[PDB]
Design an enzyme around this catalytic site. Sequence first.
Site, mmCIF file in Angstrom:
data_model
loop_
_atom_site.group_PDB
_atom_site.id
_atom_site.type_symbol
_atom_site.label_atom_id
_atom_site.label_comp_id
_atom_site.label_asym_id
_atom_site.label_seq_id
_atom_site.Cartn_x
_atom_site.Cartn_y
_atom_site.Cartn_z
ATOM 1 N N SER A 34 11.766 -19.755 10.593
ATOM 2 C CA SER A 34 12.657 -20.842 9.901
ATOM 3 C C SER A 34 12.124 -21.632 8.678
ATOM 4 O O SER A 34 12.176 -20.593 7.720
ATOM 5 C CB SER A 34 12.939 -22.021 11.087
ATOM 6 O OG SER A 34 14.197 -22.733 10.753
ATOM 7 N N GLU A 80 21.804 -17.576 16.098
ATOM 8 C CA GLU A 80 20.825 -18.430 15.248
ATOM 9 C C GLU A 80 21.384 -19.754 14.968
ATOM 10 O O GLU A 80 21.011 -20.975 14.803
ATOM 11 C CB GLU A 80 20.793 -18.079 13.878
ATOM 12 C CG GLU A 80 19.847 -16.619 13.707
ATOM 13 C CD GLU A 80 18.538 -16.632 13.811
ATOM 14 O OE1 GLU A 80 17.926 -17.815 14.401
ATOM 15 O OE2 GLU A 80 17.767 -15.871 13.535
ATOM 16 N N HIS A 122 17.540 -20.016 17.809
ATOM 17 C CA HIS A 122 16.841 -20.014 16.621
ATOM 18 C C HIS A 122 15.548 -20.507 17.398
ATOM 19 O O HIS A 122 15.566 -21.682 18.291
ATOM 20 C CB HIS A 122 17.237 -21.299 15.819
ATOM 21 C CG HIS A 122 16.701 -21.348 14.744
ATOM 22 N ND1 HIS A 122 16.853 -20.367 13.634
ATOM 23 C CD2 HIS A 122 16.159 -22.247 13.850
ATOM 24 C CE1 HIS A 122 16.258 -20.715 12.657
ATOM 25 N NE2 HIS A 122 15.893 -21.891 12.684
HETATM 26 C C1 LIG Z 1 14.778 -24.501 18.049
HETATM 27 C C2 LIG Z 1 14.346 -25.649 17.365
HETATM 28 C C3 LIG Z 1 13.979 -25.927 16.226
HETATM 29 C C4 LIG Z 1 13.943 -24.915 15.129
HETATM 30 C C5 LIG Z 1 14.353 -25.340 13.738
HETATM 31 C C6 LIG Z 1 14.659 -26.718 13.696
HETATM 32 C C7 LIG Z 1 15.241 -27.213 12.460
HETATM 33 C C8 LIG Z 1 13.995 -28.065 14.467
HETATM 34 C C9 LIG Z 1 13.288 -27.231 15.895
HETATM 35 N N1 LIG Z 1 13.663 -28.214 16.864
HETATM 36 C C10 LIG Z 1 11.771 -27.244 15.359
HETATM 37 C C11 LIG Z 1 10.874 -28.097 15.278
HETATM 38 C C12 LIG Z 1 9.774 -28.022 15.153
HETATM 39 C C13 LIG Z 1 9.004 -26.474 14.653
HETATM 40 O O1 LIG Z 1 7.779 -26.494 14.548
HETATM 41 N N2 LIG Z 1 10.150 -25.707 14.710
HETATM 42 C C14 LIG Z 1 11.446 -25.952 15.137
HETATM 43 C C15 LIG Z 1 12.225 -24.584 14.959
#
Ligand SMILES: C/C=C1\[C@H]2C=C(C)C[C@]1(N)c1ccc(=O)[nH]c1C2
EC number: 3.1.1.7
Lengths: 529, 529
Positions: free
Chosen positions: B197, B324, B437
């Site tokens: 991400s 996603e 995602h």
């Molecule tokens: C699926 C959850 C997600 C993804 C993208 C975001 C923006 C928030 C998230 N809670 C998050 C929070 C912390 C992290 O390290 N990654 C991610 C990946």
Amino acid sequence: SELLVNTKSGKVMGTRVPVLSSHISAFLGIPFAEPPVGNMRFRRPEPKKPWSGVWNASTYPNNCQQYVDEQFPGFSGSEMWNPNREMSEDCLYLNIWVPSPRPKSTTVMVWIYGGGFYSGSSTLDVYNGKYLAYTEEVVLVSLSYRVGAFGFLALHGSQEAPGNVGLLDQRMALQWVHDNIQFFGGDPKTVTIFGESAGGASVGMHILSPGSRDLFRRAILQSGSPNCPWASVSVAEGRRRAVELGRNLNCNLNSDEELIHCLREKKPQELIDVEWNVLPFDSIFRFSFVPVIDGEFFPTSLESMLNSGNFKKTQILLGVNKDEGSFFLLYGAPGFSKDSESKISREDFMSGVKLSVPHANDLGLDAVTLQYTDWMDDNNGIKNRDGLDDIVGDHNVICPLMHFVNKYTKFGNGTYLYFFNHRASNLVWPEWMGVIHGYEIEFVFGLPLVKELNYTAEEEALSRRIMHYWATFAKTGNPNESKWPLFTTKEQKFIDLNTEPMKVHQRLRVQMCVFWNQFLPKLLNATAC
Amino acid sequence: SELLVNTKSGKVMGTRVPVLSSHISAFLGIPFAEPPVGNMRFRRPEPKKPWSGVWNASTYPNNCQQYVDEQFPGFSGSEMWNPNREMSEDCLYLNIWVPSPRPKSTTVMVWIYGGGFYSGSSTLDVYNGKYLAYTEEVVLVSLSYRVGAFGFLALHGSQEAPGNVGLLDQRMALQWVHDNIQFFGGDPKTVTIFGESAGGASVGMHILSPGSRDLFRRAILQSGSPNCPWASVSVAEGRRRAVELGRNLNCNLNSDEELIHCLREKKPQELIDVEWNVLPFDSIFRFSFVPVIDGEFFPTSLESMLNSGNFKKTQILLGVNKDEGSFFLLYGAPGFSKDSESKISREDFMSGVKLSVPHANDLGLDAVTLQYTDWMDDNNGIKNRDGLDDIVGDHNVICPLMHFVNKYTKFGNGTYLYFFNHRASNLVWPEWMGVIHGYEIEFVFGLPLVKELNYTAEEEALSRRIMHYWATFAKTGNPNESKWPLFTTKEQKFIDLNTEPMKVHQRLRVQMCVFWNQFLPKLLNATAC
Ligand SMILES: C/C=C1\[C@H]2C=C(C)C[C@]1(N)c1ccc(=O)[nH]c1C2
Ligand SMILES: C/C=C1\[C@H]2C=C(C)C[C@]1(N)c1ccc(=O)[nH]c1C2
């Protein structure tokens, strides 16, 4: 005598014609207007000064002057549509096939031919109404109107060449049918005008023009709407083409009356020779002289008339064929040829797209391509050929027609929609062309009953059934005596017309037509700001 | 001792951690920069003044201040991503899991967490590099960088808050890894930076930023590109958000230095409370403080850098997950809720579309709808829910990534593309969300090997295989020792990653990405003339 008839115009002597092991009467070539020759060229038609003595209506009339298709000399498949009689400016005649014994008062069907407003003849073999008259006991009339410059040259404001005069010839024949079809056995209050292509566009233009609505009961529109992009031109655009035609003939262009006097001097073939040199674009499915939204025949923009219900409310039966584009790509798109599978390069596809949507800016041409392209197999020549066939059909026939159907159905008294998807087994055109523009006409007119024509038992079957659908709708305003669902703006039902057991479907090409009827126009308007 | 290591910064005392019936060493919380507290807030990071005595690296470090997700209190599925340690501005620390016995010089993998640049922690359970270190004998480092305003507030031109400083923290940790990973058994010339991400966006931004390229060998980008629409902001836009944040905190806005002095006064939670109030639109998948195309970290528009090859040429392994969008619609689109099938009304679909493509005019929103709508079943709530999931994913992850892949592959030295389409059997999110995602991360890090976590034999299998693909690509620049085809701009091959026997496909979402990468932008530019 069964063949002698007295009309408000004079007597008419018909002829007995054989048909399917029996016979019927035919009164061919009954004049419905004064021959529009000489200084009358371009002028509105005039009623036919009555005559005395019997008019010999024993043989087909002349055909209006028109462009003859010479692209495939000898090819029956294209020559069957060419004028089969001496062409002449004196061509305003109508033909009536009448059952025997003459009926007292039966359903009438008036056929309006439709070659893009530049051609057509009521004398074609495929237009022989005898099988339909005979088989469905209806009085069949096929009229003729001036095509090309002769019928649609338009110097708006002039009275010498006001435009739309080819639509007035049709009206005039409708008028004559109204006033005299009772003497032949027809019921002038049960007259169904039906037509294909420019004829279906004509039909729909009679449903809209105030001065035409009272002359017919219901209508059948085949592969054509009055709103098709090729069917009409603004008065300004129609004027432009009139001047250019004049320019190609070296006419004084100082004034309408000079221009018109020059054009009336030209022999008919001189107007025809330079007839296509006036289109404003390099394009396919655009014809030179077409109806002009003049404000008389058409009070306003067909779109406001459609939106406001300003049109005859009756029931209509309309539809489209599976591959409306083939014929036009074959004749004017690079990469298409009659004797090959016409697989198309993406470079030719892009030339076709541009030819098919002349009025589009690049972003428009970009939206068309994106929409009709399989980006996951984009150099596929078969997908590109078919993807272009669809572009031309959707844009030019299918979608403007679905826009008329949905606009009409909100005020009409019954809409029946068909999708013709049957390729005659004896078709001589290449298979890539599919179910071609103009190829239902032969089933509608029942040629598949002539054994010597070689159709299949299932095709004869489809003919009889389609004819019964046309005849039965003409008579009662409903095609059904497997029900052909009525079409409603909510359900969108329509049916397939083919030798297989008809099925009902919904939303004929919605996806694509949303693109053509709603998105593209908005896009083309946005981009220009 | 296996746990005592001497680095150019001082000695570090690790800890032995068990793993899959064996053990490995862990040096957790090694500082890589001076704690960016006080007047150093918003400032570029500083290297860590060496220390004396052993640094006790036996327990995870603090987490950077950040927005905590409280949308589903108690829901493991969302809380597993929240900071699991005291948050603190003193959070610039890195963690290193090292095989036992310590290797002489093996492959290094540096993990960059990626919560939209506003969150993330290296201490998450799903980010525990021990299973990967242990299983693939690689040295695994997971760094931490300042997120949110603390890491990306940007008053371009100022030296106090220049922006991108969260990207500089990453660089700084890459620098430290370069200079000291040899003492742990890693080979500083075989360092693969991988991220998901905003982390995959970070990875790709290191491949582009000149000052970062030399610090790593190859890269893995998971569901993220440096060109994703949410990944960066112009310096003007970044400035705007800085002022607004300042405005929400009642800061003198007379000058940068007043604003910045005010912001440095605020406690960390005050910046976090009003952090989302500065976005310029009502939207989903847009975060407040992100990298700014400043001209230092990024010489120019990511697009010119991509077009001109101005970027590190190496090999990269990248890919996207099947759904996603789910996660972002669930949290910010009307009609979506966790405990229902979230079927969507066309009225909500239209609200979602607008939330998903904030920068679009109506004609743009019109093109999106036309493209993602099944006009032949348009009130279908399941098609509209899924059609929106696709809109959000394609626009935000899938298509900007396929644009990076095709741009990169024209100059890179090997591209490998995957499509993760496997829904963990023990997922606690609603099924409508699909392959979410962030949900490959657990397979990449090998949690499916922990029996007590309840995955399936086929899932453990998929983990080991994905890890071997990541580890093996890190080491040799190729995932293969069933070949995972290289991706070329001509063939477009990629593969599926799921418990089923991988297949190779081509042109991951071409149709749609042609729309997002080529048509929409052209349209949005045209319409504005
Ligand atoms: C699926 C959850 C997600 C993804 C993208 C975001 C923006 C928030 C998230 N809670 C998050 C929070 C912390 C992290 O390290 N990654 C991610 C990946
Ligand atoms: C399939 C052939 C066609 C159709 C449309 C046009 C424009 C030309 C055509 N040759 C033609 C010529 C004369 C005619 O009456 N109809 C038609 C229908």
